Amino acid sequence: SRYSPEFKDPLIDKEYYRKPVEELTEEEKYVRELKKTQLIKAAPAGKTSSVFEDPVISKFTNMMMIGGNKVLARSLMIQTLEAVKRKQFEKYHAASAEEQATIERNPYTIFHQALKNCEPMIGLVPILKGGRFYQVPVPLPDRRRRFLAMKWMITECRDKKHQRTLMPEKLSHKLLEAFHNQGPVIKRKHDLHKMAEANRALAHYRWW
Amino acid sequence: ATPSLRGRLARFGNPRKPVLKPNKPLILANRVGERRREKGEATCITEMSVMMACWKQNEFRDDACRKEIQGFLDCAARAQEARKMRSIQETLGESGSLLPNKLNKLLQRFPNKPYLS
Amino acid sequence: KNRAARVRVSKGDKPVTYEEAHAPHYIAHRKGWLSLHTGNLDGEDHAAERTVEDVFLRKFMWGTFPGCLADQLVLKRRGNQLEICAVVLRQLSPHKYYFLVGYSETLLSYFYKCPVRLHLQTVPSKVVYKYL
Amino acid sequence: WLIKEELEEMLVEKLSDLDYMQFIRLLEKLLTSQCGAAEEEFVQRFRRESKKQLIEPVQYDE
RNA sequence: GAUUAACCCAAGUCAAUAGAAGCCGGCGUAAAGAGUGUUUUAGAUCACCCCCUCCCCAAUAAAGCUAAAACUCACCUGAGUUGUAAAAAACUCCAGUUGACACAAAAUAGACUACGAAAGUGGCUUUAACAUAUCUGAACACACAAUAGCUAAGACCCAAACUGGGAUUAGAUACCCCACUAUGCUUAGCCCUAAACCUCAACAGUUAAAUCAACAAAACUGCUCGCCAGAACACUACGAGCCACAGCUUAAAACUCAAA
RNA sequence: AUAUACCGCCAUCUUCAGCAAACCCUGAUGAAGGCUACAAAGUAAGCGCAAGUACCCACGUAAAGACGUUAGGUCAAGGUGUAGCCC
Ligand SMILES: CN[C@@H]1[C@H](O[C@H]2[C@H](O[C@H]3[C@H](O)[C@@H](O)[C@H](NC(=N)N)[C@@H](O)[C@@H]3NC(=N)N)O[C@@H](C)[C@]2(O)C=O)O[C@@H](CO)[C@H](O)[C@H]1O
Ligand SMILES: [K+]
Ligand SMILES: [K+]
Ligand SMILES: [K+]
Ligand SMILES: [K+]
Ligand SMILES: [Mg+2]
Ligand SMILES: [Mg+2]
Ligand SMILES: [Mg+2]
Ligand SMILES: [Mg+2]
Ligand SMILES: [Mg+2]
Ligand SMILES: [Mg+2]
Ligand SMILES: [Mg+2]
Ligand SMILES: [Mg+2]
Ligand SMILES: [Mg+2]
Ligand SMILES: [Mg+2]
Ligand SMILES: [Mg+2]
Ligand SMILES: [Mg+2]
Ligand SMILES: [Mg+2]
Ligand SMILES: [Mg+2]
Ligand SMILES: [Mg+2]
Ligand SMILES: [Mg+2]
Ligand SMILES: [Mg+2]
Ligand SMILES: [Mg+2]
Ligand SMILES: [Mg+2]
Ligand SMILES: [Mg+2]
Ligand SMILES: [Mg+2]
Ligand SMILES: [Mg+2]
Ligand SMILES: [Mg+2]
Ligand SMILES: [Mg+2]
Numbered sequence A: 001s002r003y004s005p006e007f008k009d010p011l012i013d014k015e016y017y018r019k020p021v022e023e024l025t026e027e028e029k030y031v032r033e034l035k036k037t038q039l040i041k042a043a044p045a046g047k048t049s050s051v052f053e054d055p056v057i058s059k060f061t062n063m064m065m066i067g068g069n070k071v072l073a074r075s076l077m078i079q080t081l082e083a084v085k086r087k088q089f090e091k092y093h094a095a096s097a098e099e100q101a102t103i104e105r106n107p108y109t110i111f112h113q114a115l116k117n118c119e120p121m122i123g124l125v126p127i128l129k130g131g132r133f134y135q136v137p138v139p140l141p142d143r144r145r146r147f148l149a150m151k152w153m154i155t156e157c158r159d160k161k162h163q164r165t166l167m168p169e170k171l172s173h174k175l176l177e178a179f180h181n182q183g184p185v186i187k188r189k190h191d192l193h194k195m196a197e198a199n200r201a202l203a204h205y206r207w208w
Numbered sequence B: 001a002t003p004s005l006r007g008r009l010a011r012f013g014n015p016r017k018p019v020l021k022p023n024k025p026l027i028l029a030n031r032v033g034e035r036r037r038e039k040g041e042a043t044c045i046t047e048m049s050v051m052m053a054c055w056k057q058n059e060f061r062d063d064a065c066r067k068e069i070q071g072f073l074d075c076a077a078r079a080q081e082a083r084k085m086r087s088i089q090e091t092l093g094e095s096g097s098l099l100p101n102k103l104n105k106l107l108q109r110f111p112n113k114p115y116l117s
Numbered sequence C: 001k002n003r004a005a006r007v008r009v010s011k012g013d014k015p016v017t018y019e020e021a022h023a024p025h026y027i028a029h030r031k032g033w034l035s036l037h038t039g040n041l042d043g044e045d046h047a048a049e050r051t052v053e054d055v056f057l058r059k060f061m062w063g064t065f066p067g068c069l070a071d072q073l074v075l076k077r078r079g080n081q082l083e084i085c086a087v088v089l090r091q092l093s094p095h096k097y098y099f100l101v102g103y104s105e106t107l108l109s110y111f112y113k114c115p116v117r118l119h120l121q122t123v124p125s126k127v128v129y130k131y132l
Numbered sequence D: 001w002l003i004k005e006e007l008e009e010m011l012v013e014k015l016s017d018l019d020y021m022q023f024i025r026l027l028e029k030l031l032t033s034q035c036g037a038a039e040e041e042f043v044q045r046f047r048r049e050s051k052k053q054l055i056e057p058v059q060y061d062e
Numbered sequence E: 001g002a003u004u005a006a007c008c009c010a011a012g013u014c015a016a017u018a019g020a021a022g023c024c025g026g027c028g029u030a031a032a033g034a035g036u037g038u039u040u041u042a043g044a045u046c047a048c049c050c051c052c053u054c055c056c057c058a059a060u061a062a063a064g065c066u067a068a069a070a071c072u073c074a075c076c077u078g079a080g081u082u083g084u085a086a087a088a089a090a091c092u093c094c095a096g097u098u099g100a101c102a103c104a105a106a107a108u109a110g111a112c113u114a115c116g117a118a119a120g121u122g123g124c125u126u127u128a129a130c131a132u133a134u135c136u137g138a139a140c141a142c143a144c145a146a147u148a149g150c151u152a153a154g155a156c157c158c159a160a161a162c163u164g165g166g167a168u169u170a171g172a173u174a175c176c177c178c179a180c181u182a183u184g185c186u187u188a189g190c191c192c193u194a195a196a197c198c199u200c201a202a203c204a205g206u207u208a209a210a211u212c213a214a215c216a217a218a219a220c221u222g223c224u225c226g227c228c229a230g231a232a233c234a235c236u237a238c239g240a241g242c243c244a245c246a247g248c249u250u251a252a253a254a255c256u257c258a259a260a
Numbered sequence F: 001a002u003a004u005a006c007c008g009c010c011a012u013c014u015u016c017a018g019c020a021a022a023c024c025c026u027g028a029u030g031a032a033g034g035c036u037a038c039a040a041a042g043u044a045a046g047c048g049c050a051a052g053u054a055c056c057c058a059c060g061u062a063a064a065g066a067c068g069u070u071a072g073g074u075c076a077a078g079g080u081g082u083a084g085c086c087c
Helices: A014-018 A026-037 A055-064 A070-093 A107-116 A142-158 A167-179 A184-196 B046-057 B066-092 B100-107 C047-064 C094-111 D004-011 D017-032 D037-045
Strands: A122-129 A132-139 C074-078 C081-089 C116-123
Touching: A055 A070, A055 A107, A055 A142, A070 A107, A070 A167, A107 A142, A107 A167, A122 A142, A122 A184, A142 A167, A142 A184, A167 A184, B046 B066, C047 C074, C047 C081, C047 C094, C094 C116, D004 D017, D017 D037
Parallel strands: C081 C116
Antiparallel strands: A122 A132, C074 C081
């Protein structure tokens, strides 16, 4: 790294600084003065202070990119968001008067919730006991399950079963199926849940 | 009351048969052993058994077993903090017995002398 | 391991010179150059002909002043001129030094068609930088 | 606090790392106590840029 | 090997052979304290003076007894039990509860350190009972001696060489699983061995001096008995003796090496 | 021909820190060994490391990286010891 340890990561939150001094707690107040002395890294290009910035939709874009082609990864994401948006408007005009109150049209709310329905609760971790490795069920951390949800969605879409379907139409179709707790990505979570509940006899090998 | 050592080891004055056959001389050392890593206690197992029993009944649906999952989730969070707190605090915090590294600095100030000078 | 232009460590009875005590990675940081011409500058030519003259001049002086050279030669070029600067021991008589100066200057001026001048700097004994 | 390499110049004596730490432990102990004015001078001997952006001068055009 | 020079002896030289110089040292691990105890002929000076752990804790022999577990049988219930790193085979009058029930073996105590010559001895009771008023004293006399094993007659819970089956493996005459026998137990005879090793003889005494190769369990003195003198051949061969007949005890040499 | 005579230039452990002269002490003056910071026999030039330097800084990357190890590589870079060929 070209940055020294002294350099600290920057805080892009715009409503944090605005906080009145009267609200500042004694601990928080101290921090603010301390940062003045510290050196701050230059903010990276990826994250701004806009009101539309979504860390989950930016991380999902980075996990699809190939060879640094971010203009194409971002393009696919926005097309997918627009495809989810246009498909729900088509399901909203053709619905009954009382069915329109339960139809979500915001593509973000669908993206975040669909990924939350794929997050597994427990996983299989190899533990060394008696000179052997056992795939014991272990509670996946918050980050791990958030990462797996994204990886599985991108693997399923990349999988070459759909002969000639564009990613935006594939990713949009999988996101709407997981929103209703359907599809393979959800099924893939159950298959990991069926192997952690069959091998529960080895749930004492772990210590932490 | 430390057990006796009269007429225990094979010697010249002792007429009777030996009682003890030590492979290492019975002479105090100037250091103690390092505390051995234990095994640990698995946590959130009861929350993990009632959450996987609900999936079988409900065919692994996360909409009917929501309450059970939180027990297993909230527990993991609390258990994770305890592990971090325990490791750091025990070494830094002074409770009960001392640690070998600090206890061997005390035994090396008062070394055992099995020789004459 | 790297060996080039390095004097390996010894008990301490081996005397080395400043130039002999520094390895190649100090040639422009703690050392200069023994030859200074323009051949190797960007856009200059005749770098291979100034080099052959240096290899021969260092051998001509080593065999023409045997046992008298304390340190390496410092060859300098200014236009047509070529300046040889040397550090020599005081063991040899001055009469013989003047003979070798007029013989080497003249011989090398007719061989390389250029004015050659030689500047001796006698020293009592080989200057020692440190003992490796 | 005076660094090890700078403390061997005041004393002209080679010092180990451990000896330097021992000396620093006594100076810190000295500071915690209610040291007199003279002591502050003694400790000071062994002790050795505002992070503000430089504003550009506002100019005026024709 | 030849040649040159040199060294030693010298009318001799010096290859083979033989002989001449061999005991006051040792025995925890180098070769040596030979499983134990007693005595004899005798030797010693530790025997008179002169003095200090009788008795009791797991000695021995005999007879009797039984708490825990097990086997077996019976009832009731169940449909499996065994086995494990994981399997197979095996068993299915099997398994679990309850109850009745040993010629086997003796948790804790025992962090004790005792008895006995040693071997060895650790459940209860009772009887008999544990040499010697100097020491030493035997491969063979006299008497003992773990385990294993033989012969004969009984017993049988469990374990278990052999054997059979199952598996592993390149193979597996093994390690792992199962089953079962000789055997371990009792009575009566025999056999007579051990890393029978606390590898450190018995008695008496000392803690000073040079402490003392090393390691181990500090180093010595007196006295006596026993044993041992390079390695291997050799816990062999022959001979003798023995209830021992594929045995035990005692126990060489030749060939061979220059080390062990 | 010989890299198993070598110089020379390297590899490697080294994405190390150790190498070592000269002394001293211990062990009864044996081969050997040599630390404890509330300090108990070690001190140490030199070498390397480090620091400096280069590149866009203090960062990072280069470079440097010993003494030894593997009779490591190369007699076909060149030179060279030894033995050999010379119609
Ligand atoms: C000091 N000499 C040591 C000794 O060498 C000995 C060694 O002697 C060997 C005999 O010839 C052989 O018949 C003898 N073979 C037998 N079957 N007895 C070897 O055992 C014997 N080696 C030995 N005892 N270590 O070989 C011989 C040729 C030797 O060099 C004679 O001096 O033994 C050698 C190892 O055997 C060592 O390497 C040598 O250093
Ligand atoms: K023994
Ligand atoms: K080489
Ligand atoms: K060559
Ligand atoms: K050659
Ligand atoms: Mg032992
Ligand atoms: Mg012996
Ligand atoms: Mg004996
Ligand atoms: Mg015997
Ligand atoms: Mg009992
Ligand atoms: Mg007697
Ligand atoms: Mg006899
Ligand atoms: Mg015998
Ligand atoms: Mg017997
Ligand atoms: Mg029998
Ligand atoms: Mg049986
Ligand atoms: Mg078989
Ligand atoms: Mg039987
Ligand atoms: Mg015994
Ligand atoms: Mg005797
Ligand atoms: Mg012999
Ligand atoms: Mg025998
Ligand atoms: Mg025999
Ligand atoms: Mg016979
Ligand atoms: Mg080589
Ligand atoms: Mg080679
Ligand atoms: Mg750098
Ligand atoms: Mg490099
Ligand atoms: Mg460097």
